[PDB]
C-alpha cells in the first residue's frame, strides 16, 4: 500500500489564459498571493507521495529555479522532485509515451492535469481504488468528481455530462455541449452496447470535473500501443468504454466536498472567492503553508498578514485578503 509516485501535468493549459503566460509559466501564477503549484504540492504531501515528477518545456528554466528555491529540495522532505524536459508544446499522449520509454512507472502511479485545490482526504480514495481493483483484474484508472452549485448555469466552459452506475460507479459517456452560450446543438447520441450490463443508468451534468487520476501500470503501455489518442478525457475515456479492449473498467468517484480544477479566468475567480470564504476548511490563509506566510484571521472574513500598514478612517469589506509590507492611503474601500 505504501510507496507512491506522482506525475504532474504542467505546460498543459497555457494560452487558455489569454493575456498572460507570455514570459512566465502557467502554474507560477498566485491564487491567494501564493503559486498554484504550492497548493498541488500540499495536496501531494497530504496524500502521501514519495516521488514527484513534473513536465516542463516552455519557460522550464523559471520552473526549475523555483523548485531549487522550494521547500522540497531540502533533505527532510517526504518527496523528491525530478523534472521531465520535452519538446516545446505537445499533447498528453506524447508525454505518456516518453515516460514509458524512460520506464520509471511502478505499480500504481498518480497523474494530475492542471492545478487543483481540494480539502478531500485521499486516504479514503486509495482504499476504494484498491477495493475495486481486487474486485476484477482488468481495471485501469480512477476519476474524481464533486457536486456542483445546484445548477451549472454560470459554468459554460465545463459542460461535461456523465453517465454513471448506481452500483459500481462506472462511467459510460462523456459529452461537451455549447448549449447556453451558443444555441445551435441539442442532440446527444449514446451507445446502446451497455444497456442490460448496467441497468441502473444515471445521467448527470451537475458534476464538476477534477482531472485527478489514480492509474495502474497498464496506462503507459496502452498509450504506446494506441498512439492515436492525444487527449485523456474527451477521446481516451470514451475510447476505453467503447469496446477497445473487452472487459476493461474505469472508475468514477463521487465526493460531497469541494474539489475544483483551475482552467479559466472566471472559474479561477470563483475558486478564489471560495478560498476567501470558508469553503475549504483546512485550506485557509491563516494556517500558513509557504512558511514565509504570516496571515491572521479576522472576523467578517478579513485576512491580514504581519506588517500591514493602513491609514486612519478607512473601511474594509467582506472576504478580503491583504499581503505583507503593504501600505494603504485614506478614503479607501
Amino acid at each position: 500500500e505504501d510507496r507512491l509516485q506522482a506525475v504532474v501535468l504542467t505546460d498543459s493549459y497555457e494560452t487558455r489564459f489569454m493575456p498572460l503566460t507570455a514570459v512566465k509559466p502557467r502554474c507560477l501564477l498566485p491564487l491567494a498571493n501564493v503559486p498554484l503549484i504550492e497548493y498541488t504540492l500540499e495536496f501531494l504531501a497530504k496524500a502521501g507521495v514519495h516521488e514527484v515528477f513534473l513536465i516542463c518545456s516552455s519557460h522550464a528554466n523559471q520552473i526549475n529555479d523555483y523548485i531549487e528555491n522550494s521547500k522540497w529540495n531540502l533533505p527532510w522532505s517526504p518527496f523528491k522532485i525530478t523534472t521531465i524536459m520535452s519538446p516545446e508544446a505537445r499533447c498528453t499522449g506524447d508525454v505518456m509515451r516518453d515516460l514509458d520509454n524512460r520506464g520509471i512507472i511502478t505499480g500504481d502511479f498518480i497523474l494530475v492535469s492542471g492545478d487543483v485545490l481540494t480539502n478531500i482526504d485521499f486516504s479514503k480514495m486509495l482504499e476504494f481504488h484498491k477495493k475495486m481493483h481486487l474486485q476484477d483484474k482488468d481495471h485501469i484508472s480512477t476519476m474524481c468528481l464533486s457536486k456542483a452549485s445546484t445548477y451549472p448555469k454560470t459554468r459554460t466552459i465545463e459542460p461535461a455530462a456523465f453517465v454513471l452506475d448506481k452500483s459500481t460507479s462506472r462511467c459510460i459517456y462523456y459529452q461537451d455541449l455549447p448549449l447556453p452560450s451558443s444555441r445551435e446543438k441539442t442532440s446527444i447520441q449514446i451507445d446502446p452496447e451497455l444497456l442490460d450490463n448496467v441497468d441502473e443508468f444515471v445521467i448527470r451534468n451537475d458534476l464538476i470535473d477534477c482531472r485527478i487520476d489514480i492509474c495502474t501500470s497498464h496506462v503507459p503501455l496502452i498509450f504506446q500501443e494506441n498512439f492515436d489518442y492525444q487527449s485523456l478525457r474527451t477521446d481516451f475515456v470514451k475510447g476505453v468504454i467503447s469496446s477497445d479492449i473487452l472487459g476493461k473498467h474505469i472508475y468514477a468517484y463521487l465526493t460531497d466536498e469541494y474539489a475544483v480544477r483551475v482552467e479559466s479566468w472566471q472559474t479561477y475567480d470563483t475558486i478564489s472567492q471560495d478560498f476567501l470564504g470558508r469553503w475549504c476548511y483546512p485550506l485557509v490563509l491563516d494556517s500558513n503553508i509557504q512558511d514565509d506566510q504570516t496571515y491572521s484571521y479576522e472576523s467578517r472574513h478579513i485576512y491580514k498578514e504581519k506588517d500591514v500598514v493602513l491609514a486612519q478612517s478607512c473601511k474594509i469589506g467582506k472576504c478580503t485578503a491583504i499581503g505583507s509590507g503593504t501600505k494603504i492611503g485614506e478614503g479607501t474601500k
Binding site: 479576522e298 491580514k304 500598514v309 493602513l310 491609514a311 486612519q312 478612517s313 478607512c314
Partner: protein
C-alpha cells in the same frame, strides 16, 4: 541640605524625570553626603526628611510610596552581611541606576501594551500618566489604526492639556465632557485610565472623576484599563468609597454668601473598587487582580 527644595527645582523639566523617580534621586543625594556607614545617624535623618516632605505635601500620594521602596532596597543591601563598604557603594550607585530603570521599563511596556489596542478601535482615554500616553505614541509609531476620545477632567484643567498633547502627534480627537461620559459608551471600544496610585486591595487612587467612569463601564460591559509604571504601590487600604489622605477639604458645606467666593469644594481624589478594573498594565508582566497585593506582600515581607 534640603530635599523639598531639590524637588521644587524641577519646574520646566519633568516628562523624563518622573515625579517619584526625581524624589528617589533626591533621597540618594541626601544619603551620600553625611556617610551611609552609620545606620543610626543616617536612617533617622532620612526618616525626618520624609516626614518633613509629607508635612509639605498638599495633594500628592506617590512620593510617600517611592520612599518605602528606597528604604526597602537600602535594608536589603547588607542583608548578606557583606563588607560595610562594597554594599554602600552599590547603594549610592543605585540612585542613577533607579532613574535609568524608568527608561528601561518604558521601553518594555510600550512594546507589551500596544497588543491590547486591536485593529480599528475607538478609545475613550481618561487622566494623564506617562505610561498610557507612551503606549498611544508608540502604537502610532507601530502604524496602527485607533481613534481617540478626550475626557474633560477638572483638576487644573487636564482635558485641555491632554487634547493639545494629542494634537502634536497626529491622531484625530474631540472633546467629551465628564457629565456626558455616559452617553459615549456605545461608540467606544475600550476605556483607558492612568492612575496616581494602586491599592493594596486591588483598587485605584485617581483624579476628579474615575470611579464614575469605572461603574458606567461596568454597566455597559465595556473594558476598563489601568496603565502605569511599577513604583506607585502604597500599603494603603481605603476601606470606604470616600476616605483618603487629605490636606484640604473632605466635603465642606459653606454658609450663605452674596459676593460668591466659597463654592468649588468637592472630592478631588476618588477611589474605585477592585471589581471595576478589567485589566492592569505595568513592566512587572501582564497582571491585574490579586497581583498588586502579592507585589506588596513580597516587598514588605509581612
Amino acid at each position: 541640605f534640603n530635599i523639598t527644595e531639590t524637588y521644587l527645582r524641577f519646574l520646566e523639566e519633568d516628562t523624563e524625570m518622573t515625579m517619584p523617580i526625581a524624589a528617589i534621586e533626591a533621597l540618594v543625594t541626601l544619603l551620600r553626603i553625611k556617610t551611609p556607614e552609620t545606620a543610626a545617624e543616617m536612617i533617622n535623618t532620612i526618616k525626618s526628611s520624609t516626614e518633613e516632605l509629607i508635612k509639605s505635601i498638599p495633594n500628592s500620594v506617590s512620593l510617600r510610596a517611592g520612599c518605602d521602596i528606597f528604604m526597602r532596597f537600602v535594608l536589603r543591601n547588607l542583608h548578606l552581611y557583606g563588607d560595610w563598604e562594597n554594599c554602600k557603594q552599590h547603594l549610592i550607585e543605585n540612585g542613577q541606576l533607579f532613574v535609568s530603570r524608568a527608561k528601561k521599563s518604558r521601553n518594555k511596556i510600550a512594546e507589551i501594551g500596544v497588543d491590547f489596542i486591536a485593529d480599528d478601535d475607538i478609545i475613550l482615554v481618561h487622566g494623564y500618566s506617562r505610561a498610557v500616553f507612551s503606549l498611544l505614541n508608540h502604537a502610532a509609531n507601530k502604524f496602527i489604526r485607533f481613534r481617540c476620545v478626550v475626557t474633560e477632567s477638572r483638576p487644573s484643567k487636564q482635558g485641555n492639556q491632554l487634547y493639545t498633547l494629542l494634537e502634536q502627534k497626529g491622531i484625530p480627537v474631540t472633546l467629551i465632557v465628564d457629565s456626558a461620559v455616559g452617553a459615549v459608551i456605545d461608540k467606544v471600544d475600550k476605556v483607558f485610565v492612568g492612575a496616581e496610585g494602586v491599592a493594596e486591595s486591588g483598587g485605584i487612587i485617581n483624579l476628579v472623576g474615575t470611579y464614575s467612569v469605572g461603574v458606567l463601564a461596568h454597566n455597559a460591559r465595556k473594558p476598563f484599563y489601568v496603565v502605569t509604571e511599577s513604583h506607585k504601590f502604597v500599603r494603603m487600604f481605603p476601606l470606604s468609597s470616600d476616605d483618603l489622605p487629605m490636606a484640604g477639604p473632605p466635603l465642606d458645606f459653606t454658609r450663605r454668601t452674596d459676593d460668591l467666593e466659597d463654592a468649588l469644594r468637592g472630592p478631588t481624589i476618588d477611589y474605585t473598587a477592585q471589581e471595576y478594573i478589567t485589566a492592569l498594565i505595568t513592566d512587572l508582566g501582564v497582571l491585574t487582580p490579586s497581583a498588586v497585593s502579592e507585589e506588596l506582600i513580597k516587598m514588605w515581607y509581612d
